[model samples]
Target chain A: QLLEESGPGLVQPSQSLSITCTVSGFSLTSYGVHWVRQSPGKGLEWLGVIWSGGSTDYNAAFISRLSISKDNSKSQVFFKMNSLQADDTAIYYCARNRGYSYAMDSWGQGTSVTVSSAKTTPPSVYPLAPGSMVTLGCLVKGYFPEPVTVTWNSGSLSSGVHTFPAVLQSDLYTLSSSVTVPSSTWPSETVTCNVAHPASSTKVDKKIVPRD
Target chain B: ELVMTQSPLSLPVSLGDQASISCRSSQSLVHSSGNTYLHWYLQKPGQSPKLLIYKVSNRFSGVPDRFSGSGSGTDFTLTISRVEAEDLGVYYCFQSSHVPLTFGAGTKLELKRADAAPTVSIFPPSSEQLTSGGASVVCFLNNFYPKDINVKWKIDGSERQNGVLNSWTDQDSKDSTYSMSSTLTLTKDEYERHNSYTCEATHKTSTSPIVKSFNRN
Candidate 1:
C-alpha cells in the first residue's frame, strides 16, 4: 500500500543507475510495481512495469538498457539502467498497481537523479591597471557538481582576497575571485590563482606577473 | 505519437449482460521491446480512472476474472463477461508504445434509468467581499447523472464570458452521484450596478438549461 524510492542523487555519465523501491502493507507477489520518470519541465515517461507474476515489460525506447526486478521476501523492487546520460536525469517514482483498477494507486515520494559529467577548465588571471591599489581577478569556468576551491598563492594575504560562489550556466558552473594589494608592490610581486575541482587530476594554477 | 480511436461511444446494458468496447490504434502497438503497450481503464461516475489491464490482457492484482482484454498490432478489445452496477461508467483505452502517449475517446457503459437532472443553486457574494471592492457568486450543481455537465454565467440574461471559473466534477462517495460548482467574480463597478447575476447549468438529462439567479437586493 505504501512505497518509498531510495537511490544515489548523483550518477556519472556512462555509469549504471540503480534505485530501490521499498514497500509496506503489501507483498510484491500480490501486487505489480511500475517505474515512471519525469524530467524537469517534461511529461511523464513510463519506463516499464514488473508484474506480480514476476514477468516484465518495458518501453521500446529504453528496452536496450533498462531492467526491472523485485525481491518478494523483502517487499522491494529494483530498477537498473546502464549507460546513463544527461537526458536520463529525472525524478524517478515507483508505484503499486491496484488490483481491481490495474492502476498505480500507491506511489513513492520519488528520488531525483542527475547524470552529470564533472569538468573544470584552467583558471584565468587578469590584472587591473595599477593605481593607489592593484586589483587582480581570477576566473574559473566550465565545471560541474559546483563545489570548487579557489585560493591565492600567498595564504597570509587572505584578508584582501574574496571568492564568489559558483554560478550555473548551461549545465556548467563558473566562479571568480578577486584580490587587492598596494600598488607599491607592482612589477616586483607575482600572484597565482589555484583552482581545485573534482574533475581535474591536479590543481590548476594561473599566475599574474605585472609588466616592468 | 499514435492515435487511439474507440467505437460505440455509448453502450446501454442491463444487469448481468456482457459488454465489449473496441479500440483501434493508428499504428502497431508492439514496441521493439516485444510487448504491446495497449491498456484499458474505467472511470466510474465522478471517480478517478482505474486501470483494469496493462500490456494487453494481463489483469492487475485483484481484478475480477470476468474482466479481460485481447488484441494485437493495431486492434484491441475489452470485454466484460457480466456487466454489473459497479461497472457503470466510461471506459478508455490507452497506448504508450509511442513517444507521446494517447488515450481513446472513451465509451460509456450506461444503465437504463431516468436521467437525473442536477439541482442548481446560486449564492451571492459575502458582505465582506462586496465591501472589499469586488464580489463573487457561486453556483452549485448537485446529484447529476452521466458525469457530463456544463455551466455558464450571465449578467441580466446576457452571457458573461470573463470572470467565470468552474470546478472539476466530483463524485459523492456515499451515493456515487456527481456534483460541481462554478464561481463568477464581479468588479466593484459591476456589483454596484445592481444587475442580476445568473448561473445556468446544462446536462443531457434536461431539455433546457437549469438556471438560478442572485442580486444584491
Candidate 2:
C-alpha cells in the first residue's frame, strides 16, 4: 500500500489550504485515513481522521477550521483548513489508521507547507568556547528570509574559519560558524562573531572571552 | 471511565453453526465528530489480536464477510456465521469514543465436545505440608470439552466451602480441550481428623458428576 501527498508548497496567510492524498493498493472503504502535521522542530500533532464509513473526527484545537474527507471512487483522501497562519506552516502527512487503536501504521511522504507574508525575524546569536581549546564557535538561529551572512570580528578571514550553510525550519533559518586561532594567542585575545541578516540592517555581534 | 461488559463468557458451538457475542457499554460510543468509535477484534490461540470490524460494523481490510457487527448507542453484537475450527478463540469489543478507552472482558468461543468427559484426579497432601502443621490437597481436571465445569470439595459426605480455590479454565492449543485445577487447604487438626478428601466435578457432558477421592493412609 502507498500514500502520496500533493499540494501547493506556499499558501498566503489568512487563506484556505487544501491537500490531497492519493492512495493505492487498498480500498478506502475498508480503512480509515488520518492527517498528522509536524511544525519545524516541534512534536507531531494529530489533526483529524476520516473513517471508512464516511465519518470524520478532528482534534478539538483544529475542529473549527479543519475538515477531513475522502473520495473512495478515486482512492484519494483530502485535507482542508481555513484561516491559515504562520504557525500552521508544517510538514503534513497522510496515514492509514491501523485497527482499533487509531495508530498510523502506513504513511505518505510528507509535503511541506509555508504560509507566506511580508514578515521578518532577526537572528539570535550565541558564542561557544571549545572546552579549554583555542576554537570559538557562533550559532545564529531563528531568522527569516533565508539569506544571512556570518563573519569573524567584522572582517572576512581567509583561513582558519569554517562557515556552514543555513538550514531552514519552521519558516526560520539557522546557521553556524566556527574559527580556530593559535593557542598561544588564546589567553589574551577575545573573539567576536558578526551576523548580518536582511531582517535588520545592523549586524549582531556575539563575543567570547578567553578563560584565565 | 467507561465500563464495557460482555456476555456469554463461554460459548459452545459446533462446526458450521453461527455464534454471537454481546457487548454493552456504560455510555454511548458516539463522538462529537459524528463517529461511533466501537470496534471488534478476535484473538486466536497463541496469536495476536486481529481487527475484524471497526466503526461499529465496517469489516476491516481483508476480513471475511461471514464476520459481521451490528449495534448502536450502548449495545453491540458480533456474529460469526458458519463457525470454523480456526474461529475458536476469544472476541473482545473496544471503544475509543470516550476519554479513557475501554475493552470488554473477552468471550471465549469453544467447540461443543460433549462426547468427551473430563478426566478428574485428586492428589493427597504433600508430606512436607503435613509435617509443617498444615495440609493442602489438589484436584486436577483435564481434557474437558465445553469449558464450563464446576468443582466441589467434600469431607465425610459433607460439602466443604472454606479454603477452596478454583482456577480459571485453560484450553490446549493442540487439541482444543480445556483443563482446570482446584485447591483445598486444611489445618493440621482438620487433616488429622478427616484423613480423606473427595473432589467432585460437574460438567454438561456428563449426567453424573465425576468423582475422585484422596485418602491419607
Candidate 3:
C-alpha cells in the first residue's frame, strides 16, 4: 500500500495548516490514519489520529488547534491546524494505524510546513536534586516577541541564584540559570523559573528533593 | 488493555523448517464471546506488514493453513510450518480484544540448520488456468522427519518473497513427522511472465538443496 499527501508547504501566521493524505492499494475503511511530526533536535511527536470509524484523538497541547477527519470513499485523511505558528514548520508524516492498536505500522513520506510567526512549545521541568550544584535550564524556545526575562524564586531564599542572560537563535530565545544550593533547603523547597516573554508568561517549577 | 510481548527475540530456523514463537500479554485476551483478539504479523524486508493470524487460531484471508495460532488470554503461540528463506523477518503479536490495542515488541525469525528434508511438490491448481485476476500456487512439502525443514521460493530465477501470499506447516501426529507448504498468489501479469516458480528445500541431512519448479501455462 502507498500513501501520498499534498498541501501548501508554507503558511502565514494565523493561517490554517491543511494537508490531505491519499492512499492506494488498500481500502481506507480498514485502517486508521495517524499524523506524526518531527522538529529539529526533537523526537517524533504524535499529532493525533482519526480512526476508520471517524473518531479522533489529538495531543493535549494541540487539541485546541488541531482537527482530523476522513473520507473513506475517496481514500483520504485530512488534517487541519488553526492559527499556525512558526514552530509548526516541521515535517509532518501520516501513518496507518495497525488495527485498533495505538501503533502506526506503516508510514507515509513526510511533508513539511513552515509558518512565518513565532510558536512556543510546552516547557519541561526536570527532576532536581538539592545539595548538589545543579546548573538547571529553563529551555524556552520557538520565539518571543520581546526580550526574554528569567527569575528564580525558592520560598524566601534567592541569594544563591545566578541568572544567565537569554541567548537568541533565529527567532527563538534560550534562557538558562544555575543554582547550587545547600542541603538545608532539601526535601520540599519549591523552586520556580519565571520566564517572561513579550507575548506570554511561560515559567516552569520543580520541587527540590535530595535524591531526585 | 492486554499488553502483549513476544520472546526469543529471534529464532534460528533452518531453511525449510518449523518454528514456534510465543506471545505473552499482561492481561487476559479473552472476550465475553470466548474469542481472543490476538493477531500476528510479519514485517518482511522492504515490504509492508500484513495480518497473518487474527482472533487467535483463525487465519486471515489468504493466509496459508500451515501457519497455526493457538492459546488463550495471556498466553499465545504462532507456529510457522516449514519456515522459508522468505520468512526471515520480524514477527509481531498484537492484541485487539481491548481498546488502545497493544503490540508485542517483535520476534526476529533468523536462519539456522535443520536436520531433515521434506518431500516437496510445486504446482498451481487447474482452476487457476481459468482465472483472469489471480491464482494460488501451492508449494507442498511433506514427509519430513523430526520436524526440521526450510522452504524457499523463486520467480523467474530471481529470489522472490513478494510473490508469496501465505505459508504454513502441519504435523502428522501419528508419525511424528511434519508437512509444510507455502502458497503464492500470482497476479495475471506474473502468470503471463510464464517463467518457472521454484521451491527449494534445505536441511542439514541433505548434501545440497532440493529444488522443484512449476510453470503453468
Q: Give the interface RMSD of each candidate.
A: 22.5, 26.7, 29.9
Best by DockQ: 1
Candidate 1 residue pairs that clash: A99-B61, A101-B51, A102-B51
Tens digit per residue, CA lDDT, model 1, B1-217: 5668898888867769999999999899988888787888786642445678888898866889989999899999999999888888888887767754556778878765446797665666544345556555656666677678889898877898776655544344444456665656677788678678888899998689997886555
Give me the overall lDDT of model 3: 0.64
Winner on TM-score between 2 and 3 is 2
Tens-digit lDDT track for model 3 on A82-161?
99876676778787876733346567777877676555543323332221333322333334443455556633545544
Candidate 1 CAPRI grade = incorrect
What lDDT does each candidate get?
0.72, 0.74, 0.64
What is candidate 3's DockQ?
Answer: 0.01
- TM of each candidate vs. truth: 0.51, 0.49, 0.40
Give the better candidate number (1 or 3) by lDDT: 1
B92-117: candidate 2 lDDT, tens digit per residue: 88776874345677788887754567
- Flag regions of model 2 displaced more than 4 Å: A1-212, B128-134
Candidate 3 chain A, run of 10 with poorest lDDT: A128-137
lDDT of 1: 0.72
lDDT of 1 by residue, A11-127 (tens): 989998999999999999999998878653443566888989999888777899999999999999999999998889878988776653445666787888878775444332222
**Which candidate wins on lDDT?**
2
